[PDB]
């Protein structure tokens, strides 16, 4: 059941070493190669299909990783 949430946390953990609003902000970067997998995993959590401070993506991922870890810990 919680396999999908588990795989995404692990991807975000790997590339640095609610679900709809994060994909909408992330599906703007195309010049970066590592985040491709992250974007593919997020669309499975967002029911409707998503198309097309000013801080970096490295900090947005850190924030998202925290929040996904808290969703897991709550079981949500």
């Amino acid at each position: 059941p919680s396999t999908a949430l588990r795989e995404l946390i692990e991807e975000l953990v790997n590339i640095t070493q609610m679900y709809c609003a994060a994909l909408e902000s992330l599906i703007n970067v195309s010049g970066c190669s590592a985040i491709e997998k992250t974007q593919r995993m997020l669309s499975g959590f967002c029911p409707h299909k998503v198309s097309a401070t000013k801080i970096e993506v490295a900090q947005f991922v850190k924030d998202l990783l925290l929040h996904l870890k808290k969703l897991f810990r709550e079981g949500r």
Partner: antibody, heavy 121, light 107 residues
């Protein structure tokens, strides 16, 4: 080092309430990633998880016993309290508090010495 | 609701022998299973987490394997101090424990 000590052994008469205190040392109960759980073991039987609380007060409970269980933490006192109401003789067990081995996932790496709780008239 | 069945209930092996304990889930839980060792009058001791990752302090002769339903804790070559009760644990809620396999010294 990381140590966990359960409060002294208690005798509980049936239908009454069990209060256990887990005194913690070697880690702060407000540190990111910290989680303390309660696991019990009836004499000569398997382990059963009861509840665990995280540093940010996020709590998980055993689904079969959710209604009787209450877990809380107090960072300054370095303690984790478990309350179990309406005790049954079948609850007679060694009760363990153990720190979680992950900052999100659930497995227990440091364990307390355990405490015997007998429920009987 | 997923159940962890451990087989066999008791195991008789001599030191030096290769040990194989089994833990089986009634539904897929991926690679997320932990293992504990327990001696009499003592708290459980974590050996392995996430299927196969060896815990610090635990001697290399220990290992785990498997994903989905069929899991295994293996001990390459037994030592006298390795004989005790072994429990598996589901990482996922509601964190079910197995019934436990007792590893006995054959003599």
């Amino acid at each position: 080092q990381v140590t966990l000590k359960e409060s002294g052994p208690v005798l509980v008469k049936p239908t009454e309430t069990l209060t256990l205190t887990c005194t913690v040392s070697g880690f702060s109960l407000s540190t990111y990633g910290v989680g303390v759980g309660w696991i019990r073991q009836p004499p000569g039987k398997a382990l059963e998880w009861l509840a665990h609380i995280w540093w940010d007060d996020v709590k998980r409970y055993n689904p079969a016993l959710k209604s009787r269980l209450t877990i809380s933490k107090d960072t300054s006192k370095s303690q984790v309290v478990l309350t179990m109401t309406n005790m049954d003789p079948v609850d007679t067990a060694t009760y363990y508090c153990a720190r979680l081995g992950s900052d999100y996932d659930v497995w227990f790496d440091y364990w307390g010495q355990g405490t015997l709780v007998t429920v009987s008239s | 609701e997923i159940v962890l069945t451990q087989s066999p209930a008791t195991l008789s092996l001599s030191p030096g022998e290769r040990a194989t304990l089994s833990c089986r889930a009634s539904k897929s839980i991926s690679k997320y299973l932990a293992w504990y060792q327990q001696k009499p009058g003592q708290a459980p001791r974590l050996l392995i987490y996430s299927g196969s990752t060896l815990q610090s302090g635990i001697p290399a002769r220990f290992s785990g394997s498997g994903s989905g339903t069929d899991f295994t804790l293996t001990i390459s070559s037994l030592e006298p101090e390795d004989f005790a009760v072994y429990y598996c644990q589901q990482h996922d809620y509601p964190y079910t424990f197995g019934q436990g396999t007792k590893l006995e010294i054959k003599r």
